[PDB]
Amino acid sequence: DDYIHLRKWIKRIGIILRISGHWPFRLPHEKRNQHKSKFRQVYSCLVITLGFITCSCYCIGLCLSESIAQALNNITVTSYFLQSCVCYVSFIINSRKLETLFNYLFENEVVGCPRGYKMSSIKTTLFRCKFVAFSLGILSFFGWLMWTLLPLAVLVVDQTSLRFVEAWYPFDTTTSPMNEVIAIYEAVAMIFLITAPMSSDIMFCVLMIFIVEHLKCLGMAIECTLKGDATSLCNIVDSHVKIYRTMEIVQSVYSSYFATLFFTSCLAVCALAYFLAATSTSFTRVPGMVLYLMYIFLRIFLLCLLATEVAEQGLNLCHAGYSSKLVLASDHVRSTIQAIATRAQIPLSITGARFFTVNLSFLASMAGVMLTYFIVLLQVN
Amino acid sequence: DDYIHLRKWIKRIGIILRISGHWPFRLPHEKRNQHKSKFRQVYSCLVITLGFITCSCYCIGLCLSESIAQALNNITVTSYFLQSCVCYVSFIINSRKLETLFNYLFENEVVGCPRGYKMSSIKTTLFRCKFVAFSLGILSFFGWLMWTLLPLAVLVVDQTSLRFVEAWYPFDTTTSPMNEVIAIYEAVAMIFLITAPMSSDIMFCVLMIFIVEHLKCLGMAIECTLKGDATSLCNIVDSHVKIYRTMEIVQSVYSSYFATLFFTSCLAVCALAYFLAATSTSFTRVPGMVLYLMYIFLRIFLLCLLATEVAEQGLNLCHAGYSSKLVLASDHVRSTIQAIATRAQIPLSITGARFFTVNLSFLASMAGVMLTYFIVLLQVN
Amino acid sequence: DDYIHLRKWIKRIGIILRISGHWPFRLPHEKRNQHKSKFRQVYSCLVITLGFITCSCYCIGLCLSESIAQALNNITVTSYFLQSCVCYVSFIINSRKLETLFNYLFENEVVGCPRGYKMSSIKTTLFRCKFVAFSLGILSFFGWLMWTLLPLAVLVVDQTSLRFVEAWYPFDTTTSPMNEVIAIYEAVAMIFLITAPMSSDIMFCVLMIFIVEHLKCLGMAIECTLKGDATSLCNIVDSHVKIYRTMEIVQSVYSSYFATLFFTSCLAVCALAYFLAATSTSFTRVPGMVLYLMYIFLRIFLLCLLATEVAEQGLNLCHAGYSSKLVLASDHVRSTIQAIATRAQIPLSITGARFFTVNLSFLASMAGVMLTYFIVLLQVN
Amino acid sequence: DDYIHLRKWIKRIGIILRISGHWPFRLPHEKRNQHKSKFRQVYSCLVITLGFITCSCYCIGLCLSESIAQALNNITVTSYFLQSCVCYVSFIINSRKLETLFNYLFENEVVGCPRGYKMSSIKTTLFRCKFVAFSLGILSFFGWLMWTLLPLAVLVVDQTSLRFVEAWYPFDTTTSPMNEVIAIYEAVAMIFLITAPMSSDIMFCVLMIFIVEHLKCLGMAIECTLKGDATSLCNIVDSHVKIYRTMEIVQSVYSSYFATLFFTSCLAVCALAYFLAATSTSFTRVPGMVLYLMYIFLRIFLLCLLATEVAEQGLNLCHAGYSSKLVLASDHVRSTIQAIATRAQIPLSITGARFFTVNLSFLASMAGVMLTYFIVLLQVN
Ligand SMILES: C=CCc1ccc(O)c(OC)c1
Ligand SMILES: C=CCc1ccc(O)c(OC)c1
Numbered sequence A, B, C, D: 001d002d003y004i005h006l007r008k009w010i011k012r013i014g015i016i017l018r019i020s021g022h023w024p025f026r027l028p029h030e031k032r033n034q035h036k037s038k039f040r041q042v043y044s045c046l047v048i049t050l051g052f053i054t055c056s057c058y059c060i061g062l063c064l065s066e067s068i069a070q071a072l073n074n075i076t077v078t079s080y081f082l083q084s085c086v087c088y089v090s091f092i093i094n095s096r097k098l099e100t101l102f103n104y105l106f107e108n109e110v111v112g113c114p115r116g117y118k119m120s121s122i123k124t125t126l127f128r129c130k131f132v133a134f135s136l137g138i139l140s141f142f143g144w145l146m147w148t149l150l151p152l153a154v155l156v157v158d159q160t161s162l163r164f165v166e167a168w169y170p171f172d173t174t175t176s177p178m179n180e181v182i183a184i185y186e187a188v189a190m191i192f193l194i195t196a197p198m199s200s201d202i203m204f205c206v207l208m209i210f211i212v213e214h215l216k217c218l219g220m221a222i223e224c225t226l227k228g229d230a231t232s233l234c235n236i237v238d239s240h241v242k243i244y245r246t247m248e249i250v251q252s253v254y255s256s257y258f259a260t261l262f263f264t265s266c267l268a269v270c271a272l273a274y275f276l277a278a279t280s281t282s283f284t285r286v287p288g289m290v291l292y293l294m295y296i297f298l299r300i301f302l303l304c305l306l307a308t309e310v311a312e313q314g315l316n317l318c319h320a321g322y323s324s325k326l327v328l329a330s331d332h333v334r335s336t337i338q339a340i341a342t343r344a345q346i347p348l349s350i351t352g353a354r355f356f357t358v359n360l361s362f363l364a365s366m367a368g369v370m371l372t373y374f375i376v377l378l379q380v381n
């Protein structure tokens, strides 16, 4: 059937998680322990130290800021680069729980639900997975292409300023050949520094989609069980517990990464809005800044939506198996459904380092914070 | 009895939902499939494309705003017009769930409650339905009458400016006959563009009133059941489940429409307060602006009140059938009432695209946001 | 014993509720229907129409405000006077539920609790009742005395300005005898206009203290029942239901009154802080303004504290009868205690017209709002 | 084993609680009533009256502030000193509940958990206890050393201003020997005034760590009980009740102390940020101000983290003993686990005088308040 398709996609995500330079863990379809090969183990470490030296250069470039304009110009790139740095460290540390996470979305067969629901669930999962992957991929590729190779293409068609923001360097980088080779190094570094948080967010969104479909199939399984004693209820409770444990495993790495992401993204959005609204931009950097805003807004909105859907499906699992059949069932079923409802009243939520809950109302509150601190940066001039 | 009266009113709402130009669905009292007649199917589509061309004209009129005054003058009408546009699209898409919604408030007989309560419930439902319909109808009619036909009447009694705000047009519309025919076209377009969200909000308020009366009759049915085994409890649980499913059906269309409504209404209120407080208005537009504020405040307050009443009645259904009889009942009743209370602890709330819950505290928070952004528009001058 | 003392105090509150001019209802100790005597029925109506004409004079005095200073000077007195007006109307309308409220705190004997706890409960109730009554009484009397009879005493010891803020009048009230007779009329009107909300708030605080002691005795009764089957649990459930119904009766009148009180009190606090911090006060009105702030802060803090204590005692009633005895009890007790805990998880809260919950965190949020709008009034100058 | 180690540390905390001058209560390892000896009873009272006279001097130094700069300079030290004053009073009053608190963390053996978990729990408890104690100790010692003995060392190496902020005194303290002896008295007073809230916060953090480990061992005990009837469940319920009562005992003293701490700490942080960002500091006080900020931020973050961990462990105790075994257990176990889950749904939270809940989101909200009132102090200049 089409199920063989889904594994194919959870192959490709693993492959792209090896492309960006994350630490190579064992994916499901490796029975010869090729994740410990020295080739990938030096490739990942080389990309990681390239990432660290580039992020450190752009970070110490921020501390040597004379005016507020150079600081606000370094804020955006330093924001995204330390986001990718936190993502690199958080995926290096927990290279064991990612094994369990990729073992979850490889076999997840819910026992009890009808097949006519399961096929439509697999179709919806495939469609939403492809949409979420391709949208961020296309937007990120076009944003990198503009932001890095538009002023270089302008100069190769035609006091240069090929790069957007300046950073600390050993040499002067004002003389002609140095600026070109630094621009090329910035291009390859920004490839390997952009594609890591996009890959992590694609994996998070795939996890959330699979968990939403698991919860819907669990609700249908409870209904089809109640429509008809022990074994179906035990399998339902076990699948509910597996969903809760998988969300608890998802919580930690993305808690640290989400705290860093949301704070630094709010700073980057405020700085970009100030540069677009106030200063005299030279029309070459504007296709970079108008796509970087769209990428950031799309990323925040998709993360908040696929985090809200899981809590909504849990609270809808609270209202499962509640009819005249429940009043006419035995005491065993009437106690087990009560236990399931009591445990399902607890919400499955992702917290960003326990400072906030990733919901859709949090996006509105953060948009209010952005709009409050945008007027301040406008009035400071 | 008087029950034949209530169906009459749920006839008229359907009729007014065909007047404003919504897509014709099958109401309860049609057994010959006359909702698929070509007459209404071209009437609705014609009013809809008139609405879209007028809203698009007023929307591209906003983007060609030189000063901040013309932008803030276009904000109010563009706000209301894109509200009506979102309402038109959301009622075109879900023309199947409106069938179920009109099937709900056509037969809703609760089994178990005494008749002496049911007659008073029908009287209260009729009174509050007539009040909510007639108040918005009278205020909207007087607001349209002032806002559109006061400066035209001033000119026909007596460098013209017959319309309030300017919009993009192919011609110049400054020469005399063009401005009059554009004013007449604006009059008929503003009729068909005002009466659609008012009709949708009347239908929402009728739904909320009927659901509140359903919940009160369910509480009385639980009390009269406990005062006296299987069949009454099964009918109670089934009616509770029907109420929850009907609220879940109400949630989606009004979620999208409420997000658009509340955001654009906050913008319109802030702009109107700035124009009334600061600038030198020429005393002809002031009867339009002082009625548009009253309509917006009345609409927001009635929506928030009839959304809060349902949650309050659900949490009061939690405290139903709790006396010394519950302690002296069997284990079947003591488990079924416990299941009803556990399911009733979940609140029945309407969310606006999951960004906020439509409550009465949200009206206070939005009034705080309005008061915060009114002082900013005053200080910007 | 000392219980005969408590009834004495719930006599006196009723007497003071007849002094301020509220509509005379039947208190507990009247078996000859003397609350329908014509003497009190004309006394209350006369004080009420005096209140309405004075509040209307001070309210139309606000609309004829040229500068912002006269408006901000009328804001405080118009605030308190329309607070008392809303209190007068809300106590005229619900003159039937006050019968039930005074029937509650006249006999409230909890069955099951030990006597050694009940005597200490009555001592604590008497002490806190006397403290809450006498504090507001002394502060209100000294505030009225300063605010009304300090500039009159200054003039009778010694271009006059005997009253603090001016109001609309038929005559000019600038000539000498008119200003003195208007000051005397203002004195007696401010007596009858100050003592009504203070009396209502004393009655609310007495209700909250009695309900807190009822909840504590209910918790001790549950513990002493579980330490030892049917009758004790039935009496416990009945007393819990009586507490919930009494709080539901308290909710409505104080909901409307609390919405008016909290909004108008926030306005009055902001205006008083602006007048004390910025302008050149002539040192005679300062003992009025420094006592009016203390009265308002004391009133808000005591209302919020005695509203928070009830919710805390309910959530502590959730943790009642939970030991190794519950694990060793029968299924009847293990189901009834579960039902009591499930119903006790619902909080007993007082909402101000459903816009906010009267808690102690709401006092902090309102203090933040006051501090935000105080800086604005300072910067406007 | 290593358990003998843990008692050693709960000796030392008691010893440091006698060093700072708190009222001497009976610790666990005193069987001869040496806490009522006259030596410690005069030592504690002498340090307390020294604390009160120093805090009163620095408090009346604040009221004689001409400019806003001297007031904002006195705000920080008066903040910390009245924090220590509230801590002294709150530990003098409740010298009886501290007996119960030190009796809790002396024997807390959970019955049912495996030993392999308990040894790792004791190791984690020892490590986190040593970390939390030593971090605050080292930072506080270096902060006192800089803030008090840096300008004195500068003068003894070399119109003086040896102390940071001035306070009221009987003499002039401008002449040379008076300023030196006042600086020495300030040194010893700031030792005895700094080490008391640090000691109280160390005791609070030790309590929170022990309670978190107790809750984790309780969850493991529930799992190991369900894996296998009466006695294990009774011991589990008794340990849960002991945890709830111990948190209720912790609530009161730290409620008053936390309200004072959080408010005065927000004021001190805002004032320090204004002095570091705006004015021309003379480079000697900057090592005091940059360490005082780090101490305050570390204290607030550790208190909020170890208050959030307990609520998270309680809500994780809600999901305890929920598998296919629960569906296959008897009605006794299926009712007792349901009662445990219903009681565990209530959160174990520490409230600061019931105005706010000490969580990690409250730290974010208070950081927002700090950032809001820092810009105001910058713009006031
Ligand atoms: C300099 C920040 C990296 C970056 C630049 C432009 C973008 O569009 C983008 O989104 C992927 C990322
Ligand atoms: C231009 C906005 C349409 C409009 C104008 C005036 C109103 O009173 C109104 O309420 C129905 C709507």
Ligand SMILES: C=CCc1ccc(O)c(OC)c1
Pocket (backbone or CB within 6 Å): C076, C077, C080, C139, C140, C141, C142, C143, C144, C147, C190, C194, C288, C291, C292, C295
């Ligand atoms: C003019 C407002 C009435 C009023 C004045 C002063 C007060 O102290 C007061 O508290 C009872 C009330």
Ligand SMILES: C=CCc1ccc(O)c(OC)c1
Pocket (backbone or CB within 6 Å): D076, D077, D080, D139, D140, D141, D142, D143, D144, D147, D190, D194, D288, D291, D292, D295
């Ligand atoms: C004057 C306030 C006392 C104080 C000063 C500096 C510090 O570092 C500190 O933390 C313990 C406390």
